[PDB]
Design a protein around this ligand. Structure first.
Ligand SMILES: *[C@@H]1O[C@H](CO)[C@@H](O[C@@H]2O[C@H](CO)[C@@H](O[C@@H]3O[C@H](CO[C@H]4O[C@H](CO)[C@@H](O)[C@H](O)[C@@H]4O)[C@@H](O)[C@H](O[C@H]4O[C@H](CO)[C@@H](O)[C@H](O)[C@@H]4O[C@H]4O[C@H](CO)[C@@H](O)[C@H](O)[C@@H]4O[C@H]4O[C@H](CO)[C@@H](O)[C@H](O)[C@@H]4O)[C@@H]3O)[C@H](O)[C@H]2NC(C)=O)[C@H](O)[C@H]1NC(C)=O
Ligand SMILES: CCCCC/C=C\C/C=C\CCCCCCCC(=O)O[C@H](COC(=O)CCCCCCCCCCCCCCC)COP(=O)([O-])OCC[N+](C)(C)C
Ligand SMILES: CCCCC/C=C\C/C=C\CCCCCCCC(=O)O[C@H](COC(=O)CCCCCCCCCCCCCCC)COP(=O)([O-])OCC[N+](C)(C)C
Ligand SMILES: C[C@H]1CC[C@]2(OC1)O[C@H]1[C@H](O)[C@@H]3[C@H]4CC[C@@H]5C[C@H](O[C@H]6O[C@@H](CO)[C@H](O)[C@@H](O)[C@@H]6O)[C@@H](O)C[C@@]5(C)[C@@H]4CC[C@@]3(C)[C@@H]1[C@H]2C
Ligand SMILES: C[C@H]1CC[C@]2(OC1)O[C@H]1[C@H](O)[C@@H]3[C@H]4CC[C@@H]5C[C@H](O[C@H]6O[C@@H](CO)[C@H](O)[C@@H](O)[C@@H]6O)[C@@H](O)C[C@@]5(C)[C@@H]4CC[C@@]3(C)[C@@H]1[C@H]2C
Ligand SMILES: C[C@H]1CC[C@]2(OC1)O[C@H]1[C@H](O)[C@@H]3[C@H]4CC[C@@H]5C[C@H](O[C@H]6O[C@@H](CO)[C@H](O)[C@@H](O)[C@@H]6O)[C@@H](O)C[C@@]5(C)[C@@H]4CC[C@@]3(C)[C@@H]1[C@H]2C
Ligand SMILES: C[C@H]1CC[C@]2(OC1)O[C@H]1[C@H](O)[C@@H]3[C@H]4CC[C@@H]5C[C@H](O[C@H]6O[C@@H](CO)[C@H](O)[C@@H](O)[C@@H]6O)[C@@H](O)C[C@@]5(C)[C@@H]4CC[C@@]3(C)[C@@H]1[C@H]2C
Ligand SMILES: C[C@H]1CC[C@]2(OC1)O[C@H]1[C@H](O)[C@@H]3[C@H]4CC[C@@H]5C[C@H](O[C@H]6O[C@@H](CO)[C@H](O)[C@@H](O)[C@@H]6O)[C@@H](O)C[C@@]5(C)[C@@H]4CC[C@@]3(C)[C@@H]1[C@H]2C
Ligand SMILES: C[C@H]1CC[C@]2(OC1)O[C@H]1[C@H](O)[C@@H]3[C@H]4CC[C@@H]5C[C@H](O[C@H]6O[C@@H](CO)[C@H](O)[C@@H](O)[C@@H]6O)[C@@H](O)C[C@@]5(C)[C@@H]4CC[C@@]3(C)[C@@H]1[C@H]2C
Ligand SMILES: [Mn+2]
Lengths: 113, 33, 109, 158, 41
């Protein structure tokens, strides 16, 4: 009776996509982390750990600002990589920031330390 | 183009020169220091 | 037994740390970098799931790597290595930290 | 460079002359041989060089360079696992001989952290550095070197 | 499925805890660098 009649239907059976945690518990843990970071910053400031005493002045100041800009800058670049920016644009912005940023940072560290 | 025997001679000459010059360098480094 | 040793160690630490502010800074940072880690582990245990495993690994490895880099910085600041000054240890720490940040941002997708 | 790190520059020149024309390496790097080893044997050596410079100086920068070229080798060839097992063993041996120092902590911890987080980005490797046996030595030595380090500080009191 | 066809990290509620940690760490690191260079021993 094979080779001749009609064959029954077949339907694929798909697997299960992973379950995701309910949003309130994740929100609670994000609040925990935010409180922890606020704790860290206030702990630093309350103690004399960070006292902002050796602030550069004069010409060294601008070098300081260049060092700060290079540091924040790279971070910003990475954030934009996290948002969707390509890897080639990331490497090009990294080179453009890293040449003069490296010069300014080396000069700051060589003149203030 | 270059032949096969010619490339063999060239490789052997490069090797011999390199070994002779590393021996001379070692003799000058060991003797003068 | 060990009580006297622990008390002497506490006096020594409180001395050193209030004689050098930077070692305080580092210490504080490291402690909280432990806290965060603990928190993340707590979450993974409580929800009893590891759906995005790369995200957990990134969030955990960033903390442990920042901790170990801060510890290397502290070792080089308390007693410097022969051919490496304190400025060069600080700059090496900055470079390594930036590289770790980039890799952990790529990991989490 | 590696042999200059071992003995001196004359020995390094001898080693370079040897490895330039030795047949054991030429067998798999002849013009036309376009296999994974054509580059791997290079990266390997470079990695080792940096690691040596990282182990005896204590530099964080040299450990970072070693980790970056270790990532290059992981991305280029499957025998990277050799390095993943050789660098810990070294450290482990230095612990048993009584030769622990802060430079060892710096170098090995920096290398392990950066190279491990970076070697998981190759989709063919993936989560193997944390779930496989040929990667469990390194992680083990990453824990031991903590217990030693802390313990060393305690030894300073008593 | 390609690599850029999966859901992004900010869309899975589970990853929210792990992004926050990383984000907080980076901000703290920036502050630490500044506070390190502007303090005197
Ligand atoms: C490496 O290469 C090798 C060789 O090339 C690859 O090996 C091949 O792998 C195939 C699977 O991908 C495999 O094919 C399967 O074989 C199964 C076993 O068959 C044997 O046993 C049965 C008795 O159980 C005999 O009848 C049969 O003749 C064989 O001797 C079968 O069970 C599979 O059949 C199912 O799938 C085909 C098509 O996918 C359907 O036509 C068939 O009707 C079955 O469909 C059921 O299951 C699917 C899900 O699998 C459902 O979607 C579907 O709706 C059906 O579900 C109903 O039935 C199930 C019970 O089966 C029930 O639980 C459910 O509730 C529903 O009622 C299939 O034929 C090859 O044999 C194998 N070849 C060799 C030589 O080994 C290997 O994959 C490669 N590796 C890789 C790629 O990584
Ligand atoms: C202070 C300096 C800071 C910079 C540090 C620089 C490097 C850090 C060192 C190692 C980091 C490793 C992780 C980065 C991987 C980037 C690849 C990438 O980019 O592939 C990605 C994705 O494919 C992959 O994952 C596959 C893995 C790729 C394997 C690596 C290729 C082998 C090449 C080896 C090196 C060759 C040397 C050059 C040739 C001589 C494409 O991204 P996308 O274009 O879709 O952008 C979108 C950005 N989303 C995704 C975040 C939104
Ligand atoms: C950094 C250190 C690097 C050390 C060196 C590295 C590698 C070299 C070692 C071995 C390579 C062996 C190559 C074999 C040659 C195969 C082709 C062949 O056999 O050419 C030969 C010819 O040759 C020659 O007359 C060349 C004579 C002198 C050449 C000029 C000096 C070379 C300078 C090199 C750099 C130049 C750049 C200057 C920038 C400052 C066959 O010509 P043909 O009959 O096919 O031409 C077609 C027929 N016409 C002639 C009518 C067109
Ligand atoms: C690098 C570190 C620092 C930066 C950061 O941490 C890691 O990484 C950031 C991400 O970029 C996150 C944003 C992603 C985009 C997302 C858009 C949503 O809205 C869209 O929703 C679509 C469908 O619903 C509509 O089609 C659209 O039109 C509509 O814009 C919005 O609700 C939330 C938002 C903005 C995410 C917030 C948190 C961010 C900024 C994260 C930061 C904390
Ligand atoms: C002193 C401070 C000054 C402010 C700042 O720090 C230093 O420096 C700013 C930068 O200029 C950033 C912007 C870059 C351009 C970027 C284009 C995006 O478009 C994307 O939208 C995604 C979906 O949301 C798509 O997936 C992607 O493909 C698509 O590229 C847009 O959304 C966000 C935007 C404007 C960045 C926001 C963060 C900014 C303002 C940064 C601040 C933190
Ligand atoms: C500084 C670096 C750059 C320069 C270089 O590396 C070191 O050093 C060069 C050498 O000088 C090599 C030549 C040697 C002479 C040899 C003669 C053959 O000449 C044929 O043609 C007629 C000629 O009278 C006859 O018939 C026969 O002698 C013969 O058949 C010719 O085939 C090959 C040739 C020219 C070599 C080629 C490679 C060279 C240029 C080498 C370069 C790679
Ligand atoms: C500071 C420098 C300056 C001086 C120099 O270095 C030091 O000192 C010279 C040597 O005299 C070298 C020659 C030795 C003889 C050797 C014969 C080979 O010919 C056949 O020898 C048979 C034997 O068994 C094989 O069976 C065959 O296979 C093989 O072809 C030939 O290939 C290479 C050749 C000529 C060497 C080349 C380099 C020389 C000239 C060297 C100079 C560059
Ligand atoms: C102290 C040591 C010893 C104990 C241990 O390490 C630390 O701690 C264990 C964890 O519990 C780990 C598992 C969690 C679940 C996780 C699911 C992943 O699945 C992903 O698979 C991708 C395909 O590439 C998909 O794309 C993604 O969607 C999908 O999430 C899988 O890859 C890895 C796996 C199984 C973890 C690794 C092994 C375990 C058991 C670890 C041990 C080795
Ligand atoms: C102390 C440090 C650590 C904490 C942190 O830095 C400072 O500050 C955190 C913020 O709290 C950020 C979260 C805000 C809530 C936000 C909800 C979004 O979901 C949207 O989704 C859209 C599509 O449906 C819907 O339209 C919208 O309504 C819906 O809100 C989600 O994308 C991103 C998420 C979870 C942010 C992640 C990064 C966090 C934790 C940031 C860290 C970097
Ligand atoms: Mn092969």
């Amino acid at each position: 009776v094979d080779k001749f009649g009609i064959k029954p239907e077949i339907h694929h059976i798909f697997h299960a996509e992973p379950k995701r945690v309910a949003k309130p518990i994740a929100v609670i843990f994000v609040l925990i982390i935010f409180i922890t970071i606020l704790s860290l910053i206030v702990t630093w400031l309350n103690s004399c750990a960070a006292a902002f005493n050796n602030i550069p002045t004069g010409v060294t100041a601008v070098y300081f600002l260049g060092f700060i800009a290079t540091i924040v800058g790279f971070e910003v670049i990475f954030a934009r990589y996290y948002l969707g920016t390509s890897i080639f644009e990331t490497l090009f912005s990294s080179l453009y920031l890293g040449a003069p940023g490296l010069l300014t940072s080396t000069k700051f560290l060589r003149s203030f330390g | 183009m270059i032949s096969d025997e010619q490339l063999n001679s060239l490789a052997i000459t490069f090797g011999i020169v390199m070994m002779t010059l590393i021996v001379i360098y070692h003799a000058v480094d060991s003797t003068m220091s | 037994d060990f009580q006297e040793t622990f008390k002497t160690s506490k006096r020594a630490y409180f001395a050193q740390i209030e004689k050098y502010p930077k070692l305080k800074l580092i210490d504080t940072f490291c402690f909280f970098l432990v806290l965060l880690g603990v928190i993340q582990c707590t979450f993974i245990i409580l929800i009893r799931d590891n759906f995005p495993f790369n995200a957990f690994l990134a969030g955990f490895i960033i903390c442990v790597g920042q901790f170990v880099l801060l510890m290397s910085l502290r070792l080089q600041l308390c007693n410097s290595f022969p051919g490496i000054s304190k400025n060069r240890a600080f700059a090496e720490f900055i470079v390594a930290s930036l590289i770790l940040h980039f890799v952990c941002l790529h990991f989490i997708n | 460079e590696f042999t200059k790190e071992i003995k001196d520059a004359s020995a390094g020149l001898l080693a370079a002359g040897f490895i330039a024309i030795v047949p054991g390496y030429i067998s798999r790097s002849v013009a036309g041989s376009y296999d994974n080893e054509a580059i791997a044997i290079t990266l390997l050596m470079v990695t080792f060089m940096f690691w040596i410079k990282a182990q005896k100086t204590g530099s964080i920068m040299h450990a970072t360079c070693a980790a970056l070229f270790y990532f290059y080798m992981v991305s280029a060839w499957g025998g990277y696992v050799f390095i993943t097992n050789l660098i810990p063993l070294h450290v482990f041996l230095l612990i048993l001989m009584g030769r622990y120092s802060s430079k060892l902590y710096s170098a090995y911890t920096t290398w392990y952290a950066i190279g491990t987080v970076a070697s998981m980005q190759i989709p063919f490797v993936g989560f193997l550095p944390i779930r496989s046996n040929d990667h469990m030595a390194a992680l083990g030595v990453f824990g031991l070197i903590q217990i030693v380090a802390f313990g060393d500080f305690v030894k300073g009191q008593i | 499925l390609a690599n850029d066809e999966y859901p992004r990290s900010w869309e899975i509620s589970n990853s929210w805890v792990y992004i926050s940690a990383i984000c907080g760490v980076i901000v703290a690191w920036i502050f630490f660098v500044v506070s390190f260079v502007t303090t005197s021993s």
